[PDB]
Design an enzyme around this catalytic site. Sequence first.
Site, PDB file in Angstrom:
ATOM      1  CB  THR A   1       4.351  -3.190  -2.635  1.00 42.94           C
ATOM      2  OG1 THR A   1       3.728  -3.843  -1.472  1.00 42.94           O
ATOM      3  CG2 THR A   1       5.216  -2.001  -2.151  1.00 42.94           C
TER       4      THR A   1
ATOM      5  CG  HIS B   1       8.929  -4.962  -0.241  1.00 40.36           C
ATOM      6  ND1 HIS B   1       8.735  -6.342  -0.319  1.00 40.36           N
ATOM      7  CD2 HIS B   1       7.931  -4.505   0.547  1.00 40.36           C
ATOM      8  CE1 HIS B   1       7.656  -6.670   0.377  1.00 40.36           C
ATOM      9  NE2 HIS B   1       7.157  -5.544   0.889  1.00 40.36           N
TER      10      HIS B   1
ATOM     11  CG  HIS C   1       7.221   3.678   0.584  1.00 39.10           C
ATOM     12  ND1 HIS C   1       7.235   2.581  -0.188  1.00 39.10           N
ATOM     13  CD2 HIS C   1       6.130   3.590   1.409  1.00 39.10           C
ATOM     14  CE1 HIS C   1       6.191   1.833   0.138  1.00 39.10           C
ATOM     15  NE2 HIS C   1       5.569   2.431   1.082  1.00 39.10           N
TER      16      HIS C   1
ATOM     17  CG  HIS D   1       2.448   4.244   3.678  1.00 34.07           C
ATOM     18  ND1 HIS D   1       2.955   3.722   2.533  1.00 34.07           N
ATOM     19  CD2 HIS D   1       2.124   5.529   3.412  1.00 34.07           C
ATOM     20  CE1 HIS D   1       2.976   4.654   1.593  1.00 34.07           C
ATOM     21  NE2 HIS D   1       2.449   5.749   2.117  1.00 34.07           N
TER      22      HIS D   1
ATOM     23  CG  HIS E   1       5.731  -0.110   5.257  1.00 29.83           C
ATOM     24  ND1 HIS E   1       4.581  -0.791   5.518  1.00 29.83           N
ATOM     25  CD2 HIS E   1       5.523   0.602   4.145  1.00 29.83           C
ATOM     26  CE1 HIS E   1       3.701  -0.514   4.597  1.00 29.83           C
ATOM     27  NE2 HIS E   1       4.262   0.333   3.762  1.00 29.83           N
TER      28      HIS E   1
HETATM   29 ZN   LIG Z   1       3.725   1.807   1.965  1.00 28.88          ZN
END
Ligand SMILES: [Zn+2]
Length: 255
Positions: free
Chosen positions: A195, A60, A92, A115, A90
């Site tokens: 998530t 993801h 997005h 993040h 990570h």
């Molecule tokens: Zn995140």
Amino acid sequence: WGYGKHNGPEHWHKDFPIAKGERQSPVDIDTHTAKYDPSLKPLSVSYDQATSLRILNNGHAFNVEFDDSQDKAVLKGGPLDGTYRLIQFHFHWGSLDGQGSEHTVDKKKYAAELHLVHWNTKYGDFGKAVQQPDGLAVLGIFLKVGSAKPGLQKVVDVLDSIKTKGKSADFTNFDPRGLLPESLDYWTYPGSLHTPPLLECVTWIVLKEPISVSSEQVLKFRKLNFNGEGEPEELMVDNWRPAQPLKNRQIKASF
Ligand SMILES: [Zn+2]
């Protein structure tokens, strides 16, 4: 669960009923409605002692994990009470430059969003933290396309080694301080994980000032694969969650 048509964010509520809870994130930040709170202390970021271990593709996104066995890379101050340990970071991002961030500012979408995930040390581990209302602190940083970001190049260069789901590569001596904007001005509100399992355990700290990254940097992101190695290729793009209802909650500003 994923970000496709059949398993996307609009479908998470079936397996994770909390998806329509009272403190779901991300949200849109209305800068005119956000409350300037004089009692907010400055953020305190201590990352000089940080130790990265590895980078992996979990299907993801890509995570850079750090050794959180000791208070090495911590976050404190601001709206936080107690010490929070950096566990992983990570991003997005989108298929295009017009979309990618999770949090929006006056409905404006940024190209990507970084993040930094930290957990409250009072609970002993990450797993016990995800059950507490004040268990995690996530530092959000927006990315805009412009000039390259030197501090980000080690990450980009390693992506080719973790293109598909399940791959991982040793990733020592990476210093997170190279991903920080110049100003530590922020907005803060009570939210959740973005998530699944979407647990309502986060204290969101979204920096006002975005970092610029170049087109070729962000491009290397769009080259990752949702899929596992040897399966039909699904580009890892648009792995962001749509803004959620604020519902009563108030967004505070340190400025
Ligand atoms: Zn995140």
